[PDB]
Short mmCIF file of C-alpha atoms in Angstrom, two decimals:
data_model
loop_
_atom_site.label_atom_id
_atom_site.label_comp_id
_atom_site.label_asym_id
_atom_site.label_seq_id
_atom_site.Cartn_x
_atom_site.Cartn_y
_atom_site.Cartn_z
CA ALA A 4 -4.84 4.23 -20.22
CA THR A 5 -5.61 1.17 -22.72
CA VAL A 6 -2.41 -1.08 -22.05
CA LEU A 7 -3.62 -0.24 -18.52
CA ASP A 8 -7.04 -2.02 -19.65
CA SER A 9 -5.56 -4.65 -20.98
CA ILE A 10 -3.69 -5.74 -17.97
CA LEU A 11 -7.11 -4.99 -16.12
CA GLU A 12 -9.03 -7.26 -18.21
CA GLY A 13 -6.76 -9.93 -16.99
CA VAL A 14 -7.26 -9.20 -12.88
CA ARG A 15 -10.79 -8.56 -13.57
CA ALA A 16 -11.17 -12.21 -15.54
CA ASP A 17 -9.24 -13.87 -12.34
CA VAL A 18 -11.69 -12.54 -9.80
CA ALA A 19 -14.89 -13.42 -11.63
CA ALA A 20 -13.21 -16.95 -11.92
CA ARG A 21 -12.65 -16.81 -7.78
CA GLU A 22 -16.18 -15.55 -7.61
CA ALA A 23 -17.71 -18.60 -9.36
CA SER A 24 -16.47 -20.98 -6.29
CA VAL A 25 -16.30 -18.21 -3.58
CA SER A 26 -19.67 -16.18 -3.65
CA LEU A 27 -19.77 -12.57 -3.44
CA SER A 28 -21.95 -13.24 -0.20
CA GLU A 29 -19.06 -15.85 0.80
CA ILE A 30 -16.13 -13.29 1.00
CA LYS A 31 -18.74 -10.68 2.61
CA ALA A 32 -19.53 -12.63 5.48
CA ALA A 33 -15.80 -14.09 5.74
CA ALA A 34 -14.63 -10.12 6.15
CA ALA A 35 -17.30 -9.31 8.36
CA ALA A 36 -16.08 -12.32 10.44
CA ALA A 37 -12.58 -11.44 10.13
CA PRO A 38 -10.15 -10.40 12.97
CA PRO A 39 -10.82 -6.73 13.32
CA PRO A 40 -8.59 -4.12 11.37
CA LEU A 41 -6.02 -2.09 12.64
CA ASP A 42 -6.33 1.74 12.32
CA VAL A 43 -3.75 2.57 10.07
CA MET A 44 -4.25 6.60 10.11
CA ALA A 45 -3.24 6.30 13.99
CA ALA A 46 -0.53 3.86 13.28
CA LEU A 47 0.61 6.59 10.27
CA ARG A 48 0.35 9.21 12.81
CA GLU A 49 2.75 7.60 15.30
CA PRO A 50 6.04 9.69 16.11
CA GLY A 51 8.84 9.64 13.36
CA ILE A 52 9.32 9.05 9.78
CA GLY A 53 7.66 5.89 9.16
CA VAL A 54 8.81 2.87 7.16
CA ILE A 55 6.65 0.76 4.99
CA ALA A 56 8.33 -2.26 4.02
CA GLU A 57 7.45 -4.39 0.86
CA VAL A 58 7.40 -8.03 0.62
CA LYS A 59 7.52 -8.65 -3.12
CA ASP A 73 9.38 -17.26 3.23
CA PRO A 74 7.45 -14.50 2.96
CA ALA A 75 6.33 -14.67 6.65
CA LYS A 76 10.08 -14.71 7.85
CA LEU A 77 10.77 -11.60 5.68
CA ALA A 78 7.58 -9.60 6.84
CA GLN A 79 9.12 -10.81 10.90
CA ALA A 80 12.93 -9.16 9.75
CA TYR A 81 10.57 -6.24 8.91
CA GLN A 82 8.76 -5.69 11.78
CA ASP A 83 12.13 -6.53 13.89
CA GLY A 84 13.86 -3.90 12.53
CA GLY A 85 10.84 -1.42 13.36
CA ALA A 86 8.93 -1.04 9.89
CA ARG A 87 5.53 0.76 10.79
CA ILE A 88 3.40 -1.12 8.05
CA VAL A 89 4.54 -4.03 5.30
CA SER A 90 3.39 -4.06 2.10
CA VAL A 91 2.19 -7.36 0.35
CA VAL A 92 2.27 -7.18 -3.08
CA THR A 93 -0.37 -9.45 -5.40
CA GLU A 94 1.49 -11.96 -7.66
CA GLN A 95 -1.44 -12.70 -10.30
CA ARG A 96 -0.14 -15.76 -11.36
CA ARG A 97 -0.30 -17.77 -8.16
CA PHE A 98 -3.59 -16.15 -6.65
CA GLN A 99 -4.68 -18.96 -4.51
CA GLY A 100 -0.35 -19.15 -3.23
CA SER A 101 -0.63 -15.38 -3.17
CA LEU A 102 -3.54 -15.34 -0.73
CA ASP A 103 -1.84 -18.21 1.38
CA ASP A 104 1.65 -16.01 1.98
CA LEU A 105 -0.70 -12.90 2.67
CA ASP A 106 -2.31 -15.22 5.27
CA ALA A 107 1.03 -16.42 6.48
CA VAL A 108 1.76 -12.45 6.92
CA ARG A 109 -0.68 -11.69 9.01
CA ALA A 110 -0.19 -14.56 11.13
CA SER A 111 3.51 -13.00 11.29
CA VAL A 112 3.15 -9.64 12.15
CA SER A 113 1.22 -7.16 14.36
CA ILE A 114 1.92 -4.18 12.61
CA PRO A 115 -0.87 -2.93 9.80
CA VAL A 116 -0.26 -5.29 6.37
CA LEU A 117 -1.11 -3.43 3.16
CA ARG A 118 -2.59 -5.25 0.18
CA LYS A 119 -1.08 -3.89 -2.95
CA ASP A 120 -3.22 -5.00 -6.17
CA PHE A 121 -5.17 -3.90 -8.70
CA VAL A 122 -8.54 -3.50 -6.39
CA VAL A 123 -10.92 -2.35 -9.19
CA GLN A 124 -13.99 -3.94 -7.84
CA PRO A 125 -16.00 -4.16 -4.40
CA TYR A 126 -15.14 -8.08 -4.19
CA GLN A 127 -11.54 -7.59 -3.73
CA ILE A 128 -11.90 -5.42 -0.83
CA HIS A 129 -14.01 -8.00 1.11
CA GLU A 130 -11.45 -10.36 0.31
CA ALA A 131 -8.50 -8.55 1.40
CA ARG A 132 -10.44 -7.70 4.73
CA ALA A 133 -11.10 -10.96 4.77
CA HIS A 134 -7.74 -12.22 4.89
CA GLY A 135 -6.18 -9.96 6.96
CA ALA A 136 -5.53 -6.36 5.16
CA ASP A 137 -5.85 -3.20 7.29
CA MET A 138 -4.92 -0.79 4.05
CA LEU A 139 -5.89 -1.80 0.86
CA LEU A 140 -3.92 0.52 -2.45
CA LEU A 141 -6.50 2.21 -4.95
CA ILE A 142 -4.72 3.71 -7.75
CA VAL A 143 -5.81 6.61 -9.11
CA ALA A 144 -4.75 6.03 -12.68
CA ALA A 145 -6.63 3.10 -13.04
CA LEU A 146 -9.95 3.99 -11.88
CA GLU A 147 -12.45 6.41 -13.17
CA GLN A 148 -13.80 8.93 -10.81
CA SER A 149 -17.09 6.82 -10.08
CA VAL A 150 -15.18 3.59 -9.38
CA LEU A 151 -12.45 5.70 -6.95
CA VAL A 152 -14.96 6.85 -4.81
CA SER A 153 -17.12 3.63 -4.81
CA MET A 154 -13.52 1.96 -3.88
CA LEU A 155 -12.88 4.44 -1.23
CA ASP A 156 -16.13 4.30 0.54
CA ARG A 157 -16.44 0.23 0.84
CA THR A 158 -12.69 0.07 1.94
CA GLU A 159 -13.29 2.85 4.31
CA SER A 160 -16.90 1.27 5.84
CA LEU A 161 -14.75 -1.89 6.52
CA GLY A 162 -12.38 0.22 8.87
CA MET A 163 -9.62 0.05 6.16
CA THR A 164 -7.49 2.84 4.92
CA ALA A 165 -7.37 3.67 1.73
CA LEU A 166 -3.51 4.10 -0.03
CA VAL A 167 -4.74 6.26 -2.47
CA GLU A 168 -2.06 6.36 -5.12
CA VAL A 169 -1.09 9.21 -7.68
CA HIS A 170 1.88 10.02 -9.79
CA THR A 171 0.48 13.90 -11.35
CA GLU A 172 -1.04 16.73 -10.04
CA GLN A 173 -4.27 15.69 -11.64
CA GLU A 174 -4.57 12.54 -9.84
CA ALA A 175 -4.01 14.09 -6.33
CA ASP A 176 -6.83 16.43 -7.76
CA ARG A 177 -8.82 13.67 -7.71
CA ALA A 178 -7.99 11.85 -5.19
CA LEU A 179 -9.16 15.07 -2.54
CA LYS A 180 -11.97 15.66 -4.67
CA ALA A 181 -12.63 11.61 -3.65
CA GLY A 182 -12.19 11.86 -0.24
CA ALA A 183 -8.82 10.46 0.14
CA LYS A 184 -7.57 10.23 3.73
CA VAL A 185 -4.07 9.18 2.88
CA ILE A 186 -2.17 10.02 -0.29
CA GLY A 187 0.37 7.94 -1.77
CA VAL A 188 2.92 9.95 -4.59
CA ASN A 189 4.54 7.07 -6.18
CA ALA A 190 8.01 8.38 -8.31
CA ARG A 191 7.54 5.20 -10.49
CA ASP A 192 5.36 5.68 -13.36
CA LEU A 193 3.04 2.51 -13.63
CA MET A 194 3.17 2.40 -17.16
CA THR A 195 6.53 3.85 -17.99
CA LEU A 196 8.37 2.25 -15.35
CA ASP A 197 10.36 5.93 -15.54
CA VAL A 198 11.50 6.68 -11.88
CA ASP A 199 11.09 10.70 -11.05
CA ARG A 200 12.23 11.15 -7.15
CA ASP A 201 11.00 15.10 -7.70
CA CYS A 202 6.91 13.81 -8.03
CA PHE A 203 6.53 13.86 -3.96
CA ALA A 204 7.85 17.27 -3.46
CA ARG A 205 6.25 18.37 -6.45
CA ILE A 206 2.80 17.50 -5.39
CA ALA A 207 3.03 17.60 -1.65
CA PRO A 208 2.63 20.78 -1.68
CA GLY A 209 -0.75 20.74 -2.93
CA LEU A 210 -2.45 18.39 -0.16
CA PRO A 211 -4.51 19.75 2.92
CA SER A 212 -3.05 19.31 6.52
CA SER A 213 -5.15 16.53 7.61
CA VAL A 214 -4.08 14.23 4.61
CA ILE A 215 -1.51 11.89 5.48
CA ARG A 216 1.18 11.71 2.51
CA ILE A 217 3.57 8.74 1.69
CA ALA A 218 6.13 8.91 -0.60
CA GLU A 219 6.39 5.55 -2.63
CA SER A 220 9.62 4.11 -5.00
CA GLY A 221 13.05 5.67 -5.51
CA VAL A 222 14.36 5.31 -2.30
CA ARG A 223 18.37 4.79 -2.76
CA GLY A 224 19.25 5.11 0.79
CA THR A 225 18.77 7.20 3.95
CA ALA A 226 19.23 10.35 2.30
CA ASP A 227 16.57 9.52 -0.37
CA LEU A 228 13.76 8.36 3.06
CA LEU A 229 15.27 11.80 4.50
CA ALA A 230 14.62 14.09 1.41
CA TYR A 231 11.19 13.00 1.42
CA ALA A 232 10.17 13.70 5.03
CA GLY A 233 11.69 16.50 4.27
CA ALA A 234 9.09 17.27 1.47
CA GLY A 235 6.26 16.31 4.37
CA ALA A 236 5.98 12.40 3.67
CA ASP A 237 5.21 11.17 6.69
CA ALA A 238 5.69 7.55 5.55
CA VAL A 239 7.86 6.33 3.13
CA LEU A 240 7.68 2.82 1.25
CA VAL A 241 10.73 1.13 0.07
CA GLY A 242 10.58 -2.61 -2.03
CA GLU A 243 13.13 -3.12 -3.76
CA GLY A 244 15.77 -2.28 -1.58
CA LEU A 245 15.01 -4.43 0.83
CA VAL A 246 13.43 -7.31 -0.72
CA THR A 247 17.12 -7.86 -2.23
CA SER A 248 18.74 -6.96 0.51
CA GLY A 249 21.12 -10.00 2.50
CA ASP A 250 19.65 -8.87 5.44
CA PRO A 251 15.65 -7.27 5.29
CA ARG A 252 16.00 -6.60 9.32
CA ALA A 253 19.04 -4.49 9.07
CA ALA A 254 18.55 -2.62 6.17
CA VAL A 255 14.71 -1.49 7.88
CA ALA A 256 16.89 -0.62 10.97
CA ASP A 257 18.80 1.06 8.40
CA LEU A 258 16.09 3.46 7.07
CA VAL A 259 14.01 3.31 10.67
CA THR A 260 17.17 4.98 12.21
CA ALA A 261 17.78 7.32 9.05
CA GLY A 262 17.64 10.99 11.14
CA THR A 263 18.40 9.95 14.38
CA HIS A 264 22.19 9.01 13.75
CA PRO A 265 24.80 9.52 15.15
CA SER A 266 22.46 10.04 18.17
CA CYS A 267 23.32 12.39 20.48
CA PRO A 268 25.63 11.49 23.25
CA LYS A 269 24.84 10.54 26.55
CA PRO A 270 25.93 12.44 29.26
#
């Protein structure tokens, strides 16, 4: 909690600096005027195990992901070149028609309007980073703008908090935020304690199609993959290989 507080101090400092040039009123107006957000719940309910492909030329990479059959593209913030990060989010937004998930350390309302203004349809909320009051506030504001929150948990206790807050989509991240220990069994352990109306996403740790399928077999509606796609020589084919994980070899044609 304390080390994460130090990371969040930097995030909050940068938000405040941005707000000194683009005011809260201005970013609220930009968000209200933006092209409409896509209903990410409907996207996630489409048949088949959804692949959420992460960007972390970004537009070309996102297009390769969409071409390969990705359901959603995730774009991770780079705190060190933030205006460039926003330009890249805009470029990704113009490159694909599928929903865009913005990952950042989202802790203040300004960031929610900012994400919407730049075309995000889905926004990451990290339960380990947010006291319950803040989780509820951020979730409610995200939804009020027509976006969907990916409410990310790593423990059973965090999942319970997410449910109490009103989460509609819960992502179980196999990777610990601080220790970086990847525990693939996290999803299968936590997934049973979720109600049927909640959409379940397994994040991280996918080594190949078998791991994606294992998450799906434990109830994952979609699976988020980063490293194995960003470092692929062929992101389009790599995404297609994940999208077809359970539908190959295809049944023969008479």
